[PDB]
Amino acid sequence: ITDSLAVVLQRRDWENPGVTQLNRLAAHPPFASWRNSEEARTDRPSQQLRSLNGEWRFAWFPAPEAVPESWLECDLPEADTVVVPSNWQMHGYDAPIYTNVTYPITVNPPFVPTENPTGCYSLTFNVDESWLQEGQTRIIFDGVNSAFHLWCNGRWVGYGQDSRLPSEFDLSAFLRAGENRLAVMVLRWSDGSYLEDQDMWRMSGIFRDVSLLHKPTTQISDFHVATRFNDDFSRAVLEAEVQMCGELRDYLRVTVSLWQGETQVASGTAPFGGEIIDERGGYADRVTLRLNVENPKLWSAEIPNLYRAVVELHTADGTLIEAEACDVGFREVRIENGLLLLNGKPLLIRGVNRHEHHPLHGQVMDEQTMVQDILLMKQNNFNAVRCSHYPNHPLWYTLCDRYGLYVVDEANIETHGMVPMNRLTDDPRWLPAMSERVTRMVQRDRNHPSVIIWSLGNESGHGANHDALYRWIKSVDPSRPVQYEGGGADTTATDIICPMYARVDEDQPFPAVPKWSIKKWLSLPGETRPLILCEYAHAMGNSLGGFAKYWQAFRQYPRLQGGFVWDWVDQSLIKYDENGNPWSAYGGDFGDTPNDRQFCMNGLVFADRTPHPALTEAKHQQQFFQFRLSGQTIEVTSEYLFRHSDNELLHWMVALDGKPLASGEVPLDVAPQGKQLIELPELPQPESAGQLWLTVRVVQPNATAWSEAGHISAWQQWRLAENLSVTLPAASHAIPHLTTSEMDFCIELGNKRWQFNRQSGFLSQMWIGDKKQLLTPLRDQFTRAPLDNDIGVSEATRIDPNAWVERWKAAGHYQAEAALLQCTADTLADAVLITTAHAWQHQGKTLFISRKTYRIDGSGQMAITVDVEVASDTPHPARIGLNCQLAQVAERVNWLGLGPQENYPDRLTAACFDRWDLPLSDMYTPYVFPSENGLRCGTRELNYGPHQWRGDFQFNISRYSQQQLMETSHRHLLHAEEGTWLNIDGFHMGIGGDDSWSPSVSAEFQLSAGRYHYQLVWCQK
Amino acid sequence: ITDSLAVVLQRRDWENPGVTQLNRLAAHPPFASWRNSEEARTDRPSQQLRSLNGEWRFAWFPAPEAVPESWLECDLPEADTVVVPSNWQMHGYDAPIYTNVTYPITVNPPFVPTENPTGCYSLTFNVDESWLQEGQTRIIFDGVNSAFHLWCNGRWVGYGQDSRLPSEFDLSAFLRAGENRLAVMVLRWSDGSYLEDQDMWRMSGIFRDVSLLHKPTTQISDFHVATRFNDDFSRAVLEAEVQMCGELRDYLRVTVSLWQGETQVASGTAPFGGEIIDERGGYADRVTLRLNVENPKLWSAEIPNLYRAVVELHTADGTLIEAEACDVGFREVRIENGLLLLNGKPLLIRGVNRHEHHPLHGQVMDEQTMVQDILLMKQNNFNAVRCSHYPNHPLWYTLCDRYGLYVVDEANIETHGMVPMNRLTDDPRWLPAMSERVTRMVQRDRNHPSVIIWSLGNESGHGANHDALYRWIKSVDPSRPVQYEGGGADTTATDIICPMYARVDEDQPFPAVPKWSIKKWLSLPGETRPLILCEYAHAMGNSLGGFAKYWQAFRQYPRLQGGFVWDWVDQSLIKYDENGNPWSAYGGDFGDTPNDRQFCMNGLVFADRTPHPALTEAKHQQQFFQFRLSGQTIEVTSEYLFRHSDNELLHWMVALDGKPLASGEVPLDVAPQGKQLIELPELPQPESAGQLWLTVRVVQPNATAWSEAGHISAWQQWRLAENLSVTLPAASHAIPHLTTSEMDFCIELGNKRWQFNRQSGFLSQMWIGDKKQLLTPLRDQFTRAPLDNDIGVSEATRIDPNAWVERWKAAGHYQAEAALLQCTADTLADAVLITTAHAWQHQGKTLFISRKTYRIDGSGQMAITVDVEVASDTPHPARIGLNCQLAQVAERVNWLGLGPQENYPDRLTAACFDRWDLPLSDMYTPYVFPSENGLRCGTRELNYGPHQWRGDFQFNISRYSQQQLMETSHRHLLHAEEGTWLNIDGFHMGIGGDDSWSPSVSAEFQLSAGRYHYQLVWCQK
Ligand SMILES: [Mg+2]
Ligand SMILES: [Mg+2]
Ligand SMILES: [Mg+2]
Ligand SMILES: [Mg+2]
């Protein structure tokens, strides 16, 4: 009766911040409870550890108060068969919601809405009778969103909160020999919900593993590891403290052995009971061993050398009661003199923020995904990762320990939607609930060599609870620094200045919480801390413009030590339709209201782990090698702090406009933080006209754990010398034939004809024989299919008059009327000259003036010449070029310029100048939210079909007009047009991306000169 | 049903640190809910605040699971009618328990015994319909020990822990019109018991006030006061921040007024809504006014200047919603450069620890008692009080605010009997619970000028939780230091070094937590804080030995800023004898087990608030006036930091061996910390043989709110001269007659005769006529009826070998046998001379050797001459002197020496050298636990009845033989013996008292000389 839902629900513990648990065990690092040392040593699987993962029965309800009392005893006839772990939203029971800051529920802490999607999980299973004879048997839940009531065999067991840390319960007095049945009742919202407002998809269910662990009554209940070194790391001391539970006896001992593979390096045995700490004594049930290690191998992301520690509990005769263990890695993380050091050297953080997201699985993680993500970040030269914004799946930490990556363990606390942000975190009544999220976090992951910083959570302003919490960690684990960003990023609750989205050189002086220019911040009066951005370079869509700017500051200021790009992957989901054909879904796509539409898309990779183009920019900038060129000498500078360059080959190449003149290979032999000098054999000194370019690559001959042989880690390119062309055009044996009509001008020359509408003023059509070449005339373009950064957070409803898009619209840029001021056509001896002038106007105001001259000669080469005037008072145009719809549709595209990836003016350092040729298909980037894309810069010659253009411009070429782009909300809605659309730009505006909710394109990238000039040559073959 | 006892108790909330309250409302400053601004100004009584103190029905059960369900519905026929507040033990329901360290319950956290004296209180009452029309009705329990469930009209209402702070609940939705009934169920043991292990009587029940408050729906829910000054305090800024609950409407206003008397000093009005705090704006529902005050009058324990602040919640139009209020005192407490400052002057803390105890009422407090203690303290030179060790009665802070005493608020946390002491304090699972104890305290007391220091608790060792809660306070409130003694007194969780019992010059090097000499601490490498003993000078019984030594150091060192004596009032309880007579009881006096005996009495005053002789040693040492005497010039020094000597007259007197030759009076005119010079008119230089002695006193002409007219606040006394007596005793006509026999020596002279037992060697009898003088022979005495300090913790079951008592005992001091070595008579010209030589021995060893000469002259005077040899390898004896039981019983006692009060060698500075005369009665100290007492040192002449002694000695005289004192365990068990007992000490060991569990007698006070000699003259009248 007391176990009846009717009773258990009365109290409504999901509406009490005072009840965050009910009968839950205490936190600790990971246990398996080995019963044999070797197994323990080599990490084999423990029989004392059982997974309860797989097929469970499930049933959804709109409210806890609607679950049938019978559910405790009997399986619902209307129940399903689902797999655990899993997110409910992913099986169609209800919708995932995607809001950013706004809380999915009504803000009435600590209450939650009566209608509260309740999920009833249940499972029947067998228990070995042997597990009933001795020890203790607990159930461990790795993750449950957001809260839950538990039952076994009909009897109420416990209750938990915090979706992101494990929940343990003793079942010992409830199991039965034979068949037992579990019944979990999970809830969507609880008071917990106000502490978990992360900007991500709001799901729910039993998303992490479920296991049973069998322990001996007298057991190891906890253990911490530690490492101390001398002034040079030539000697370390490993210090292990072990705790016990159960009957204390004089014959119990603890043995601690440290292995180096198959080698045993140090061992220590002792009996329980430690130092006298206070007037009352010491701990009888604890012990600290101290192992000396000579010349330890240090762990680091560059070389994640690991050791194995085995902790055995046995009897004086040597009879083993139980075993626990862990990989250990020797490192010292410290802040000295303003710098964040690691093993003695100042780190340079190359990191990224990363959520646990999976397009099909939701919030469920799995090795494969975890590893894929790992290999990628490493291949792209990432050093660290931040657990935005909650503790991760247990195994994540193990993977970072072995692959080598710096982690930032973050507490499951975000209360963004509160006003002010402070509300909860400055309220003592909430201290208890928050404390649990910090403390159980440190209790669980503290022994991982990879965790090197602790974080108090995210965007919960600055409260007093924050200070209490910072002090707690500082006390229980003096070994790692502590960071929190809320409230201004440089509060008493943080060891590091960790702003989010603070610019390189421009201040953003918000009242109370300004973001100073990062260079400025360091020197503020009294400031001594290192600065490491927790979020920067907001990679939403076509972004990561200005990246090179940070890296350049990072490398020049000792106290600027990195940052974490926001973010790893796109939080997009998969959907279908007719043929159950998949499609990437975003905010709103589920009927979810409210929502932040595409704002859940900001990764460097698509949800499927395929790259956005921005990635490459990243890889290039974070490279570990830096090159300088002086004369015929290449200086290589290492940026590794511990390794020698031992899997590295330098490849150099020289070429004339894409034509290779000389190659070479030189093995790298540089010492962490050192230089090498590579001497170049005499270099080719051509006469032919052209650009001489030098290009270097760093190749890894051998494979590694995270890279296959041949991998390319770095590159650099230099322009050697130019040879201008002073060659005269071949004399011709005829000249074009100008022809007038009421309607247009027709110029012919053989089989080629060009036609110029007299009323429009534009080259309206062209022929190669009988074949018409255009579908739309060739006109001036001054706009673009607004980028995400361009739009910011402006909506139909909420209009942000600052977003470039709004400025462009309001200015009429999109609806301006082109007017012909003057067309003229003349025959000269050697050629035919056409001339135009147009003006664009919006409501009586002229924005732009286009003055051109075409010149066709005997060779059949048309020379275009553009001269543009931009009204000084009009919003800087996104672009200054031409565009037209081609009738042809070829397979490949070939150009001589920056490539091969999409590149923009404020994003093209990763781009190398050379001869590229790709499939048309690769010229359109499939961003989930359509906008301008595909651009390539610094182009000198461009070939598509029988055409060919030459000049100095940027271009894009695809089967979709900007219009289409700018009108389709999802890439899957896009349809290919008739021929190919070509945008030829003489000038393009930067894309920016310092952040996606404000203007970020810096001055240098704004088309602001007033007057632009360009010239093209257009010919066939 | 879900209100039923079976359901509520199912969860055993009192056995879970997870749950510490259900449905309890937030903490806050004190509320009244006035509805008329003046009544609030004037602290009238609000009709909105109703008391529920008075008669209540009560029933007692051995366990929670034994109360009948009917109780929820109806009263129990077998129920009684008690007065509330009260401690159930004081009514005989179960016994009170006295333990110090050792918990009164088996240590099994967080479990409590199934046997749990449960007290069911009930009350029936009537609510005015009005209270039900509008607003909210809350109930406030100001103290309930140790936990309790609560029901209203049948319905479960909530629950609470922490016996020392208020618990509020909303009854609003449970009330009816007319009759209403409460059913409060009080528990004895709860998980919260593990955090209340203060050394004191373990009682239980509803011990503080019970009230009902009615507050408007839209109301003032919080408010804090804050004062800032300029450099010289010439200007201050009063910052009041107000918080509101309810419906927020633009027409709401908050007005804050500052009054000083009837005069309005300042005021400020404003709408709600503060400054931006973070990216989400600010508090809509708060506002902060800032009132400028010029030349504000400052608050000190010296001058408790107070201002009244009024808070008005009204509509813009002027309608009033409600008014709250508080007394405000302007003062800044800051630590700077190692010093603790008050309005920029360095404090000198003259204070004491104080528990809230009442002989008749147990733990319940009252205006009277409270006020009494405040006056005693102020009258005896006290400066401040320490809330040992929990928050006090609300009324107590007001009283100190108004009376003038620095308080140290202390959280109700003590885990003393744990092992180690850290045990729960360093465990994150107890963080919430501890947190709730500090935060609510701060929340409620934060506005009392009186409170200048926060303390995190008592003897709980040092755990991480301490560091968290320390920071918390630091952030939340930065206007007061934070101190804590645990784990070393100098940890990271305390702004001040505050040891308990550290000696002045002796280090006590305990492991992990040593107690350095207070002078040495201050200077350890890197140390910089101020030192203030949280607890010193253990006042157990006959104690305070050495107190002067402390005050000389506090005086000498800057950073040595004072301490808190331990303690104020004895923790004794009253019982009754079959003849209706009441007696003081103590540990074990109730059948309680286990108990700590007399360890509950340590106060400087008797449970009835009567003074112990020690209260004078403290009064004099803590005086605020220091005197220096130069020739004939008295140099006065003020120790007040704020006041000028405005009610001070200095009286001076010169006297010869007790005779007054000259007097005087001079007004006192001294600035704080300044000096005054007083020049004494020529003093008589009489010829008369003797000792001239000058004595100064400071008297307070006018009465104070805390002291009557003619108050003596300080006293100055120096030896001016000596006139050695060259006289010879006029010739005598008569001459004693000696009569030898086989067993004696009769000496005769007139009506008097002296008989010396020849086998004893001692003077066996004496006669004045036919009247026999002695009842007991006169013999050499070397022992004392053991003091509390000599006993320590020594017990029968647990002998403490290091104890004085144990040593003396083990050495046979108490059982030595006198062996005659020599007894001889001799005839002289003018008289008769007896020579004896005795030896004390034990098991073969000779401890002492007394060699005497008696010399009866014809003047009728008997001259004694003592010479003692004490083995060097024997424990310095308690005393070296004589004793005998007299047959006479005089009424008074008159003497020439130190007094009036009982004084010992290491405690006599308070005593003045004069001629005292007091009723035999006053020469006995009624220490609840009997032992040696009443002594008076530096005696020159002692008169009792016809007898009269002369020499230089110390003596005590009562009706209790040392043998009985040491034999009786309670003062009410002693019976007067036939005559009068007299002890004439030639030397006496000090009493000590630096602590009562180790040997606290310093070197300079032990009788280690080896050889002693004293001389006496015994004569009649
Ligand atoms: Mg809850
Ligand atoms: Mg957020
Ligand atoms: Mg509890
Ligand atoms: Mg104690």
Coordinates of C-alpha atoms in Angstrom, one line a residue, chain B residues 255-454:
Chain B
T255 CA 9.6 53.9 0.9
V256 CA 12.4 53.6 3.4
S257 CA 12.8 56.0 6.4
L258 CA 15.5 56.6 8.9
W259 CA 14.7 58.0 12.2
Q260 CA 16.7 58.9 15.1
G261 CA 14.4 59.3 17.9
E262 CA 11.3 61.1 17.0
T263 CA 13.2 62.8 14.2
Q264 CA 13.3 61.7 10.7
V265 CA 16.8 61.7 9.5
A266 CA 16.3 60.6 5.9
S267 CA 14.0 58.9 3.6
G268 CA 13.7 57.5 0.1
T269 CA 11.0 56.3 -2.1
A270 CA 11.0 54.2 -5.2
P271 CA 9.4 51.8 -7.6
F272 CA 10.6 48.3 -7.9
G273 CA 13.3 47.1 -10.2
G274 CA 17.0 47.2 -10.0
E275 CA 20.2 47.5 -12.0
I276 CA 21.0 45.1 -14.7
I277 CA 23.0 42.2 -13.2
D278 CA 23.6 40.0 -16.1
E279 CA 22.7 39.2 -19.8
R280 CA 19.1 38.7 -18.7
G281 CA 18.6 42.1 -17.0
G282 CA 17.7 42.3 -13.3
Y283 CA 15.3 41.9 -10.4
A284 CA 12.0 43.2 -11.2
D285 CA 10.8 42.5 -7.8
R286 CA 13.5 44.2 -5.8
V287 CA 14.8 47.7 -5.3
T288 CA 17.6 49.3 -3.4
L289 CA 17.5 52.6 -1.7
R290 CA 20.5 54.5 -0.7
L291 CA 20.2 57.0 2.1
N292 CA 22.8 59.6 2.8
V293 CA 23.6 60.3 6.4
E294 CA 25.9 62.9 7.6
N295 CA 27.6 62.8 10.9
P296 CA 25.8 59.7 11.8
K297 CA 26.1 58.6 15.4
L298 CA 28.1 55.4 15.7
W299 CA 27.3 52.2 17.4
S300 CA 29.6 50.4 19.9
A301 CA 29.4 48.1 22.8
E302 CA 30.6 51.4 24.4
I303 CA 27.8 53.5 23.1
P304 CA 25.0 51.5 21.5
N305 CA 23.8 54.3 19.3
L306 CA 20.8 53.1 17.4
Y307 CA 18.5 54.4 14.6
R308 CA 15.2 53.2 13.6
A309 CA 14.6 52.2 9.9
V310 CA 11.1 52.0 8.5
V311 CA 10.2 50.2 5.3
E312 CA 6.9 51.2 3.6
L313 CA 5.2 49.2 0.9
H314 CA 2.5 51.3 -0.7
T315 CA 0.7 52.4 -3.8
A316 CA 1.8 55.4 -5.6
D317 CA -1.4 57.2 -4.6
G318 CA -0.2 56.7 -1.0
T319 CA -2.2 53.8 0.2
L320 CA -0.2 51.6 2.6
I321 CA 0.1 47.8 2.1
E322 CA 2.4 47.0 5.0
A323 CA 5.4 48.2 7.1
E324 CA 8.4 46.2 8.5
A325 CA 11.2 47.5 10.6
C326 CA 14.4 47.3 12.3
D327 CA 16.9 49.1 14.5
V328 CA 20.0 50.1 12.7
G329 CA 23.4 50.9 14.1
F330 CA 26.2 52.4 12.0
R331 CA 29.5 50.6 12.4
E332 CA 32.2 49.0 10.3
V333 CA 33.9 45.8 11.3
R334 CA 37.0 45.2 9.2
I335 CA 40.2 43.2 9.6
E336 CA 43.2 45.2 8.4
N337 CA 46.8 44.5 8.6
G338 CA 46.4 41.7 11.0
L339 CA 44.0 43.7 13.2
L340 CA 40.3 43.4 13.8
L341 CA 38.7 46.9 13.8
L342 CA 35.6 48.5 15.0
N343 CA 35.1 52.0 13.5
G344 CA 38.7 51.9 12.7
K345 CA 39.9 51.3 16.3
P346 CA 41.3 47.8 17.3
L347 CA 39.0 45.9 19.5
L348 CA 40.1 44.2 22.8
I349 CA 37.5 41.5 23.3
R350 CA 36.5 41.0 26.9
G351 CA 34.0 38.3 26.5
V352 CA 32.4 35.0 27.4
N353 CA 30.8 31.9 25.9
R354 CA 27.1 31.6 26.9
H355 CA 24.6 28.8 26.7
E356 CA 20.9 29.4 27.1
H357 CA 20.2 27.6 30.3
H358 CA 17.6 27.9 33.1
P359 CA 17.7 26.0 36.4
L360 CA 14.0 25.7 36.5
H361 CA 13.1 25.9 32.8
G362 CA 15.9 23.9 31.1
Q363 CA 16.5 25.4 27.6
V364 CA 13.5 27.8 27.4
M365 CA 14.5 31.5 27.6
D366 CA 12.8 34.7 28.8
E367 CA 13.1 38.4 28.7
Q368 CA 14.1 38.5 32.4
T369 CA 16.8 35.9 32.4
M370 CA 18.3 37.3 29.2
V371 CA 18.2 40.9 30.6
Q372 CA 19.8 39.6 33.8
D373 CA 22.7 38.1 32.1
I374 CA 23.1 41.2 30.0
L375 CA 23.4 43.3 33.2
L376 CA 25.7 41.0 35.0
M377 CA 28.1 41.0 32.1
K378 CA 28.1 44.7 31.6
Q379 CA 28.5 45.1 35.3
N380 CA 31.4 42.7 35.4
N381 CA 33.5 44.2 32.6
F382 CA 32.2 42.0 29.8
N383 CA 32.4 43.2 26.2
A384 CA 31.0 40.4 24.1
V385 CA 29.3 37.2 24.0
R386 CA 29.6 34.0 21.9
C387 CA 26.5 32.1 21.0
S388 CA 27.9 28.8 22.1
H389 CA 27.0 27.0 19.9
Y390 CA 23.8 27.8 17.9
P391 CA 21.6 30.6 17.0
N392 CA 20.0 32.2 20.0
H393 CA 16.5 33.4 21.0
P394 CA 15.5 36.1 18.6
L395 CA 15.1 38.5 21.5
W396 CA 18.7 38.1 22.5
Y397 CA 20.0 40.0 19.4
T398 CA 17.8 42.9 20.1
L399 CA 18.9 43.1 23.7
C400 CA 22.6 43.2 22.8
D401 CA 21.8 45.7 20.0
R402 CA 20.2 47.9 22.6
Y403 CA 22.3 47.1 25.6
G404 CA 25.6 47.0 24.0
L405 CA 27.5 43.8 23.5
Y406 CA 29.4 42.4 20.6
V407 CA 27.9 39.1 19.5
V408 CA 29.4 36.1 17.6
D409 CA 26.5 34.3 15.8
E410 CA 27.2 30.6 15.6
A411 CA 25.7 27.9 13.5
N412 CA 24.0 25.0 15.1
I413 CA 26.5 22.5 13.9
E414 CA 28.7 20.3 16.3
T415 CA 29.8 16.8 15.5
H416 CA 32.2 16.3 18.3
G417 CA 31.7 12.6 19.2
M418 CA 32.4 11.5 15.6
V419 CA 35.5 9.7 14.5
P420 CA 37.4 11.4 13.3
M421 CA 35.7 14.7 14.0
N422 CA 35.7 15.3 10.1
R423 CA 33.5 12.4 9.4
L424 CA 30.3 14.1 8.2
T425 CA 31.9 17.6 7.7
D426 CA 34.1 16.4 4.8
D427 CA 31.3 14.4 3.3
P428 CA 29.4 15.9 0.4
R429 CA 26.3 13.9 1.4
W430 CA 26.0 16.2 4.5
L431 CA 26.7 19.5 2.6
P432 CA 23.0 20.3 2.1
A433 CA 22.2 19.8 5.7
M434 CA 25.1 21.9 6.9
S435 CA 24.3 24.4 4.3
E436 CA 20.8 24.8 5.5
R437 CA 22.3 25.6 9.0
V438 CA 24.6 28.4 8.0
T439 CA 22.5 30.1 5.3
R440 CA 19.3 30.3 7.3
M441 CA 21.2 31.8 10.2
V442 CA 22.8 34.4 8.1
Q443 CA 19.4 35.1 6.5
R444 CA 17.7 35.9 9.7
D445 CA 20.4 37.6 11.8
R446 CA 22.1 39.6 9.1
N447 CA 20.6 43.0 10.2
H448 CA 21.8 43.1 13.9
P449 CA 24.4 45.7 14.6
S450 CA 25.3 43.6 17.6
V451 CA 26.4 40.7 15.4
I452 CA 30.0 41.3 14.3
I453 CA 31.4 37.9 13.6
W454 CA 30.0 34.7 12.0

